[PDB]
């Protein structure tokens, strides 16, 4: 997953989970990448699927 094309003003809301380094399950890549940007690049991907 690459978040260079972010942030985005909106995300579709399908469920394909990713697990962030904050131990939070992100609903999809768009949600995850917007969070990475919001954290100013501190949040990273732990693994694919639920945490």
């Amino acid at each position: 997953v690459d978040c260079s094309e972010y942030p985005k003003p909106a995300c579709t809301v399908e469920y394909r989970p990713l697990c962030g380094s904050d131990n939070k399950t992100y609903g999809n890549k768009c949600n995850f990448c917007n969070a990475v940007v919001e954290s100013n690049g501190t949040l990273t991907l732990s693994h694919f699927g639920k945490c």
Binding site: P9, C11, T12, V13, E14, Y15, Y26
Partner: protein, 185 residues
């Protein structure tokens, strides 16, 4: 199974929009971004209960898709959860609406604007969307937006969340019904 219930494809999970029909052939509507690249749909995460197969998909530009039921025994309720749906209508600014999705359940709000353009990026732009102050989260895609017994739209996307509040855009259901020549029941 009814509007708002979970539906699984080979890729992920979305929500059933509305159960519709054409003559004696039953289908269900959902988001186009969910039907895009999906063939078979199941009712459970174990993928043991088949629902049907994708018959149409329109995304981006629009955001709707239709799935033909192949499961002959599963109940196909013309409702959203327990809420009966009897007709479809056009959204209007200030209209009180309700959304049901497989992740967040039922949430209400109002229509704040019409004919909105939403850019999901990478060339995925959708037009003519209904803007609302209703929240939605991953898994809610394709779920119904209704107003009483009236079908209004299908959940497409937005920002924010149900805890802090958000903005969600919906595809007008009337356009989907017309494109496929189906009706709610």
């Amino acid at each position: 199974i009814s509007g708002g219930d979970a539906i699984y494809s080979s890729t992920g999970r979305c929500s059933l929009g509305f159960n519709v029909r054409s003559g004696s052939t039953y289908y269900f509507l959902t988001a186009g971004h969910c039907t895009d690249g999906a063939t078979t749909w199941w009712a459970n995460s174990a993928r043991t209960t088949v629902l049907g197969t994708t018959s149409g998909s329109s995304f981006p530009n629009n955001d709707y898709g239709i799935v033909r039921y192949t499961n002959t025994t599963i109940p196909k309720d013309g409702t959203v959860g327990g809420q009966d749906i009897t007709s479809a209508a056009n959204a209007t600014v200030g209209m009180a609406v309700t959304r049901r999705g497989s992740t967040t359940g039922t949430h209400s709000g109002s229509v704040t604007a019409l004919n909105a353009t939403v850019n999901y990026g990478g060339g995925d732009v959708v037009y003519g969307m209904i803007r609302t102050n209703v929240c939605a989260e991953p898994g809610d895609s394709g779920g119904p937006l209704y107003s009483g017994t009236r079908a209004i739209g299908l959940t497409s996307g937005g920002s924010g969340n149900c805890s802090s509040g958000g903005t969600t855009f919906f595809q007008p259901v009337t356009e989907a019904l017309v494109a496929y020549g189906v009706s709610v029941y």
